Subunit: 379 residues, 4 copies
């Protein structure tokens, strides 16, 4: 694993220096978002040194060191390609196919060999970013990047705690007393998300993030195909909650399509779990079907807690869209299909908040029926 080590050590050293030093130049500019005619020397070094190290890896050909080893390597290749994209060394709408031949072949080889997208994925920097003596992979040494990544990690892990609790209710049923504890575990995990997102909101520098962090999550070509950038939402957890709570519907083209466009962007194990939720029942419909149990102790106790969980999830979606996406994407973007991705994100936030709409299906009425169901039972 000499060649593999050599590339990783490069990613954890010079790679960070080159990008950092390059970000310094971009920030000094007046445009700040411009990359043309700047750091031309640093770009050649980053491209050159990375390619050689990658080329050494591409020579070894087929290797089977296990999923973790392969995924880690693919991450470095993706981190490398992502940087080249940020610095305009490679640009999709400018090419017909990727100019980074070696890296593309290697990335497409590993990705297809382990069932993941042939590029940098969220897990590469968050849940599966191995730290060496305290430092883990990063594009730059900027404090704002670390804040973004760490809080995405905290957020993601909090959602996993919430989806795991929800999945354990399935075998017990909504009337099970133990389901009341899982429901509370779920509630706490979702609150950890609200808190996690708040801290990020109160510490991340809006400007530094939009000009020095975000530009590394851009779409770029791998081979001839264009692959979009990773999202902090690329993991089963969040969608597992949507389906299990019944807030979203797999039978709707809009939602299933979204799942399809993200499967390869998460771990194989997360894909398996997500797909399975698409053919399992949900708690919403369960409670709705238990109308003749309205005067049951477990019903009032569990429905009450359930409804609270549905609200927290919707709260977390409003917090994300209304606050996070708003303060670091929409605003800085108006100053410097954007209105399209914003509109999709809205239907998503409203789908979780269960608001009233006529253009899309929502649980507003179902949730209201259940809320008004708890009224009749407190007697």
């Amino acid at each position: 694993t000499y060649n593999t080590e050599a590339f990783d050590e490069w990613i954890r050293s010079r790679f960070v220096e080159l990008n950092s030093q390059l970000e310094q130049l971009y920030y000094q500019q007046t445009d700040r978002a411009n990359v043309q005619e700047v750091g031309t020397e640093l770009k050649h070094t980053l491209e050159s040194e990375g390619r050689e190290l990658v080329k050494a890896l591409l020579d070894e050909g087929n290797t089977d060191e296990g999923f973790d080893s392969a995924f880690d390597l693919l991450g470095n290749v993706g981190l490398y390609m992502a940087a080249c994209r940020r610095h305009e060394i490679t640009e999709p709408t400018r090419e017909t196919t990727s100019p980074l031949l070696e890296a593309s072949a290697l990335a497409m080889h590993i990705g297809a060999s382990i069932g993941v997208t042939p590029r940098f994925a969220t897990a590469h920097l968050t849940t599966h970013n191995r730290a060496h003596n305290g430092i883990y992979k990063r594009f730059t040494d900027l404090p704002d990047e670390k804040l973004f990544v760490d809080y995405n990690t905290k957020g993601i892990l909090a959602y996993k705690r919430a989806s795991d609790a929800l999945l354990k209710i399935q075998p017990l049923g909504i009337s099970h007393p133990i389901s009341h504890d899982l429901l509370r575990v779920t509630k706490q995990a979702l609150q950890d998300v609200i808190e996690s997102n708040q801290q990020l909101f109160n510490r991340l520098d809006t400007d530094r993030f939009f000009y020095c962090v975000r530009p590394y999550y851009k779409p770029y070509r791998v081979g001839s195909v264009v692959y979009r950038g990773a999202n902090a939402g690329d993991f089963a957890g969040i969608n597992v909650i949507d389906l299990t709570l019944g807030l979203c519907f797999a039978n709707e083209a809009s939602y299933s399509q979204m799942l399809v466009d993200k499967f390869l962007y998460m771990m194989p194990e997360d894909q398996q779990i997500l797909r399975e939720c698409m053919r399992r029942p949900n708690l919403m419909d369960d409670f709705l079907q238990a109308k003749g149990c309205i005067h049951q102790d477990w019903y009032q106790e569990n429905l009450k807690l359930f409804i609270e969980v549905c609200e927290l999830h919707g709260q977390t979606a409003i917090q994300h869209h209304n606050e996070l996406v708003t303060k670091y994407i929409a605003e800085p973007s108006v100053s410097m299909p954007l209105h399209v991705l914003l509109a999709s994100l809205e239907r998503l936030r409203d789908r979780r908040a269960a608001v009233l709409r006529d253009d899309i299906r929502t649980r507003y009425y179902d949730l209201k029926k259940l809320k008004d169901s708890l009224r009749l039972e407190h007697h």
Copy 2:
């Protein structure tokens, strides 16, 4: 409708018969005696259950999915377990099981889905589906419900602890996020201490030993004798042992224990457990990071790491001096409790010294 017919029976008459039978046993002076008592109730339980099982055995091969099959196997196991409790079947008395139909069915399902052909802990705890608030049980006794509910709470708390620990593996012990997982682990283990305490302060020692425990006895399935389920039949607890490095897979005593429980947990738990047997542990990781002693992450993470090991080892003594003390291989149970607690011993390998070295490693700071 046969599956449901049997399930509905298990959730109704089955509970009545056992309950009514437990009433007779308790009135006795011996109370542990079952000979010449409830002979009528025993015949009914055996008879009604067999007929319902026989109807199922006729359908032959069925593939309704893992959950459906496991649930059915649970009812068959619950039925056979009852028969064992009431002496309708007794291992040291037989050469092979007298419950022919139930045995065939149980062995068929179990082997078909990779689980033991009898009632397993998950059948009554994590995978016990409730209907309108009531879930499978042997009797309607309050002490059974206390035992099962707290075993469930305990088990689920351990799963939260093992899941947090496994997420550190890809991040490493020096990762800042590993400090949060380590704290999540600490909290989950505390939930176990609290969970066990509540059980200790509410369960009726007598009712449990004469009306609850006798349903977890060993009985024959076919010609083979299969031991009773244990609240410790799940990956979680052993995942923590290996990940924290408190136990060693390279030791016959421990790997044998794992082998004797694999079939007693869910296939998914088996997969996870086996995997931990070929993965590194945090203990050795910290020990190998001696040249990082003056690192911020080393001081912070290690402290919590040691607090985690102490909560686990300590939560071990509590259990050891409870379901084992108040109620052959006694030594094998002491070594297990000693490895977890990392006590000092000369007969078995322990982390006592390694843990002390690490505790005193925080000293310099």
Copy 3:
């Protein structure tokens, strides 16, 4: 499974009648490839009856009857959508999104839920086409369709026999005596393919196939995304042979991309096996590395048989391209990106035949070195 049964029984009855009767009209025409202003009544019935049956299924929502049941249902939905595409009831370059709302949602739901493409796949009509009292799913009752499907099935099954034998050599090694038998089993299976393809070549009606069979394998939209038609080559087997024999290379963008574009078009189990071959060694390189064993009995005996297998595979690719694709696609198409897909198919045939080229990597030299290696050893 009433609604599921109702739809299947429809697919096996009226569906076949409507398409058949419709094919009769198209054939009578002078253009014969025209579909405008013809069978307008039959089209409305096919579209109408199918949609209603699908709509009934879409209502049931999430169901978990097992992989086989779900895959079978998805097949009927795909068969239905494919027909609508053939009859121009739906056309990709004419739409922005699919006009078949219910069918799209259902197809995308099942597909994503079990990890397969949301449309009709080769297995749906070949290896996983269940027959009822002798009759299995089909678009029409035409004899030429049955010939096409049956021989694709025979061909596919023969390739599976060849890939399975090759994979069993891996744990034994190329010098193992038992590997000589597997190598012979492989040789026989590949010959069954040559024979299978020959029979198809000598019995299929070139015209009927191009105007009455092939038009059902066209690309159509599912939701907003366009999904290409199934190919008799959508299964692990063929590519497993390519990689195990070392005739193709996973480290090349061109090949890995091709694998990615077909994974969802085969069974999950075939995907698993294929991906794994991308990180395993191959026999070609093994033999090349055993140069200091040239005077070994197993070497001459096994290398000789190996080289024969490589030739048969290449023979089967030439037979397919030069004969089959030529007589039923290229010619009838010149009479009535086509030159693009033909060019890709050529690089593929030459990759297996191991011919000499400068534009792509081939085993021509490696195979020649090994052939000339057997000469030195027969002494």
Copy 4:
């Protein structure tokens, strides 16, 4: 390098020591005796192997992948099996295994990958990697090579038969393509008959019973006794039994047999086998298609189907009267051979009548 050091030993000195030892045993008059003979060679085999194993046990947890671990377990099992053959270790003589290091290592790997902690058939047959033409073996005797090679050929032929049969399931018995799979199945089963015949006509009855078979004896791993491998330890053969409907998973006798062999085959073979236990079979399918008697597919497919059942049942008698006849649970071996052959019996359920009904069903045509 420890893994390779042990493997290279198994492929060199290990073979020499055992071979040289077999020479001494054969010269004797008893020939089956091992007491007071080759005492020097035994010490060397035990000593050299243990040291190499001890080096491996030190590395602790390793995750080099299933193939690497399984291969290593095989060497450890081959080593322990030899020690058993030479009486260096004997089950009915011990309470626990005297080979401490080897036991721990074997139990560790086996449990970590889900296989029995000893030498399994695949270790010498389908998964025995050859180096420059030579693959793992206990001795250099020609009769061992004959036994192993033909077991391998037999096994691979059965895998071809089970794979063809499983591909009919999704197509159905009335599918035209099922007629080809049925013929592929027929040919594969014939390859088995031929394979077994060659073994019968070449293997030296004496050399095999005194120099080959004694290496497949049962021995202790830890404290548990694990039986020796059988050329029948793989899914294939049992997949054919269930798919053809010749055997029944709902019968304790058969499901128990499956349970006692799962760990003796590859995890992938276990998965496939278990699944067959909850799937339909062709026998019952044909029986249920009585109102299709005058169908073309019914006549053609059924004929070949019956020829397949007869080849299997007949290939059973051959084996039964060979490795069992020429060389307790003898009855359980008769019933198995009788279910496969579908003979007439009153003590166990068989397909004799069902098969006769189907044979006479072709009569009307």
